[PDB]
Amino acid sequence: PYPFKLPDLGYPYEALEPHIDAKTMEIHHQKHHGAYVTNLNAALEKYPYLHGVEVEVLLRHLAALPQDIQTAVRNNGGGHLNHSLFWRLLTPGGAKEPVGELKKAIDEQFGGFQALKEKLTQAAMGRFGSGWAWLVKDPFGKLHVLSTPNQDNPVMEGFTPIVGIDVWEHAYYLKYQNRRADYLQAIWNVLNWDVAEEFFKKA
Amino acid sequence: PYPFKLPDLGYPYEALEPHIDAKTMEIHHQKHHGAYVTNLNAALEKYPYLHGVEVEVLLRHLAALPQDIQTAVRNNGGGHLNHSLFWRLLTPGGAKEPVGELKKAIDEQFGGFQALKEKLTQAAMGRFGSGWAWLVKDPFGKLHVLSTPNQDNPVMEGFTPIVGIDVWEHAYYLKYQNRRADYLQAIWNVLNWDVAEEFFKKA
Amino acid sequence: PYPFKLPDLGYPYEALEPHIDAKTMEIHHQKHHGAYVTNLNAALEKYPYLHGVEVEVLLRHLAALPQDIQTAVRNNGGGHLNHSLFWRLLTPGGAKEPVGELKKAIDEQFGGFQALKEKLTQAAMGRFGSGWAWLVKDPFGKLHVLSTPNQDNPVMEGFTPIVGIDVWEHAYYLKYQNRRADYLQAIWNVLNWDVAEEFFKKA
Amino acid sequence: PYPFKLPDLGYPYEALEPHIDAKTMEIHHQKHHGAYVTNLNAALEKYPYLHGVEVEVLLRHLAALPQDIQTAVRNNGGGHLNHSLFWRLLTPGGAKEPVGELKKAIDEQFGGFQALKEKLTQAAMGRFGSGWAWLVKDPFGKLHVLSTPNQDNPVMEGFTPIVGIDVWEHAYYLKYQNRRADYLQAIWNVLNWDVAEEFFKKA
Ligand SMILES: [Mn+2]
Ligand SMILES: [Mn+2]
Ligand SMILES: [Mn+2]
Ligand SMILES: [Mn+2]
Structure with missing residues (x-):
């Protein structure tokens, strides 16, 4: 609650090189x-x-x-x-593909990890201007891929975020410039699916 | 849950004459x-x-x-x-002025019943087109007067409705025609504050 | 321009009986x-x-x-x-079916009067709450059927209105109550297509 | 009209150093x-x-x-x-302060260049996410300062753009990173007010 705190990254700023x-x-x-x-x-x-x-x-x-x-x-x-x-x-250091209960949900609702990666990429690329691309869970057990503008978070609409990808230009401009597609290709190398699994289970 | 049911009015259609x-x-x-x-x-x-x-x-x-x-x-x-x-x-048959815990909240946040009646009237009159005027409660204990368009309900935004007034034309056209103000003047004679108190307490 | 004046209705209030x-x-x-x-x-x-x-x-x-x-x-x-x-x-007194230049456009673009009636009826019935259904023209010579909420007029978006049908409950409640569909069937009996033709020519 | 072409930039990429x-x-x-x-x-x-x-x-x-x-x-x-x-x-090469007819309008309506800079700066800083800040004219001869999201242009709403300042992060991230305010201070050094004057006269 108030006063809110900036959380530590928990890892060195150089830990995701050469991806970010x-x-x-x-x-x-x-x-x-x-x-x-x-x-x-x-x-x-x-x-x-x-x-x-x-x-x-x-x-x-x-x-x-x-x-x-x-x-x-x-x-x-x-x-x-x-x-x-x-x-x-x-x-750093977690599974590079979905695992556990989130994996089961993913293979069952989307077909497999490759299909989910195509939908999330399509969602991140399709967000014009600033925003985030998300994999979310609703109260009825359904997974959804959507994007939100600016700093809007899916909780505002009653969803629970599991994976979020920052597509504001500040997230990739220094290294990728206008190449958002190359930035998204790199993000898959650094996402921690064990953490995504923790988010899904508490969801 | 599904299938939903139309509730009985619980009173004769003529019970609110000559008000509605x-x-x-x-x-x-x-x-x-x-x-x-x-x-x-x-x-x-x-x-x-x-x-x-x-x-x-x-x-x-x-x-x-x-x-x-x-x-x-x-x-x-x-x-x-x-x-x-x-x-x-x-x-029919309930208190014609706020009572109980809702009364306390009303006198404390708005000043008294007359002040609340002016805000709700202002809200009902100000709703252009179809909609509802409401007295709602939020999770932090605050009372709010607002209006919503068409059949939108304040629960969509996380509020709990306590009093709602229907300002679609079908609610008053047969007896009052274009005179929405006269319809609102009549509504105060028929609102059941004991029921509003039940809604507030469970809120 | 200002000061705006109430236009004359132009015919006796009872001219459109038994339709309105x-x-x-x-x-x-x-x-x-x-x-x-x-x-x-x-x-x-x-x-x-x-x-x-x-x-x-x-x-x-x-x-x-x-x-x-x-x-x-x-x-x-x-x-x-x-x-x-x-x-x-x-x-009162005009063509009950499209005539002239507007007729050629309707025949060409919608297939004929029957197809347009149907489309206009769907737009009117589908306008939830207060609003209007319209047959409009854009600057590129195309016709569109759409509805607008409350008192919004299609010029706000660049269109030129040709036919507008009022679907606020006040337009039909005294005679038809909730039966908006019966009101729409009746409206076709009173529309003046010679007037629609002038609106079309003039823009 | 179609096919649309990329306009020439008109000067060397380095013409605006050290400002951009x-x-x-x-x-x-x-x-x-x-x-x-x-x-x-x-x-x-x-x-x-x-x-x-x-x-x-x-x-x-x-x-x-x-x-x-x-x-x-x-x-x-x-x-x-x-x-x-x-x-x-x-x-490059134009007046660094408003001149001519646009200057008289700015002096009259905002009080002078200083007041306008301030207003335009507030609109640019207040545009959360991607967008643009503008000095526009309406058909009634009045000037307005406003911002629009993403790539929306004020002609969509009937205004004629005179001065537009790009506030998408791509416009300033390589040199200024998060410091949008430093980018805005620098932009005043490169604006061409003789060009703004033509846009103003022409509409
Ligand atoms: Mn970010
Ligand atoms: Mn109703
Ligand atoms: Mn009307
Ligand atoms: Mn730009």
Whole structure:
């Protein structure tokens, strides 16, 4: 709850080379995610009555929040939640293909990992402007591939995110420039499916 | 859960005269609410996996529903939920002013019943086209006055409805025609605050 | 331009019996349309620099209007324009089927009157809540059938309206109650296609 | 009209150093804008009846375009028009402050260049995600400062663009990383106000 904290990456900024550059990892965590946490805190400071609430609860009830902080919480709260999930998913050393219960769900609803990789790529490439591509779970057991604009998080619509891929240009511009496709091809080498499995099971 | 049922009014169609006419009460319940229940059921028939879900759960996760029934559930599910709350709120013989815990909340957040009546009237009058005016509760204890378009229900945004007022023209046209203001003046004579208190407490 | 005036209806309130009742014609014209004109004028009253502009132009440039009157102009200016067209299209004494240049376009593009009636009926029935169904022309010479919510007029999006059918409940509730389909069957008996032809030629 | 062409940039990629880096100018023009032109042409290729229309007209009539190409035209046609204006406004050798008729309008309406810089800076900084900040004119002779998301161009809403500043991360990431504010301070050093003056006169 408030005051929110910037989580440590938990690994060196250079750990994902040559897939994502150390310079991006550092700026992406310290400057972009850092700003989101600071701004989120700045917006909630004025309202003591909301200090005991988890960010996910704030995002599901955005319409209830005072009108002067709705946008600030959506943007920075979403920014904080998305990136926190992202750092965890990039943790080095985990399985490079789906495993466990998430694997079963994937093979059963999409056909196999190759089919899911095509849908998520199609979703990430298709998101015009800034946004995230996601594999989400709904309360009825169904998996969905979708994209959201800017820092919007699927929890706002009642989904539970399992995998999220950051497609804002700041995520890949320094190393890939306009080549978002090459950035997505590299992301598959670094996603930690054991972490995705933890997210799916708690889901 | 599915198959949904049209609830009985629980009172004679003529019980609210001369405030709302018996002919409207009958058409409003049998034809309008009846159609919503039928259409809601028609849309869910194709998806066995959703047959054990309460309408409120369906409405909070609209984005998860198959794309071919999202609109049908929003419109008819919302229509079913709104009118079901409405018939209960019009039950004859209850308190004509807020009472109990809802009263305390009202006097504390709005100043008193007269101030709440001005905000809800302003909200009902201000809803252009079809819609509902509502007194809702959020998870943080705050009361809000808002209006929604068509058959949208505040649960879609994470609120719990306490009082809802139907401002579609079919609710007042036969007796009041274009005079929505006169219809709202009459509604205060028939709202059951003991029922509103039941809704608030379970909220 | 400003000050806007209620147009004459042009024929006796009872001219369209038994298809549309006299009472509806009186209230629809004097009370509903009378209210839109009054409210539009009140909005524009505080902005002299907008006094010599036709309503079509204001609607095409809603985003440019002062912030405090954009909704008022969209809703009331749209209401004024929509009903002004409607009274003319209902003028007694014209062709009951498409004629002339509009007929050639309909035959070519939709296959004939029968196909268009069907499409226009589907658009009217499918407009949930308050709204209008339209046959419009775009700058490229193509015809489209679409519906708009509340009092939105298709000029807002660049189209030129040819035929508009009011589907707000006030347009049919006194005579038809919930039976919007019976109202639509009856409307074909009163449309004036010689008027539709002028709208088509002129744009 | 179709086929659309990539406009010449007009000056060496390094002409705007040290304010905008040469590498950004090359990629922005050849790769980003080159992609928008290619994608726009591919969309319009299957619709000959739209071949002699200027891009401004297509954007004003998006709702009239075939359903399957509306997004493609909005995004790529908007991208083509936005950047075409941008290259011209960055032409070396013009006035660094407003001049002529546009200067009189700015002085009258905003109080002077200083006040406008401030307003334009606020709009650019406040555009969350991808977008553009603009100084536009409406048909009524008034100037507005606003921002649009992604590649939306203000002609979609009836405005005539005078000054547009690209705030997508690709416009500033190689040199400035997250520091959008430093990029905006630098942009004032390269804007060409003689060009802005022509855009203003011409509309
Ligand atoms: Mn990011
Ligand atoms: Mn109703
Ligand atoms: Mn009407
Ligand atoms: Mn750009």
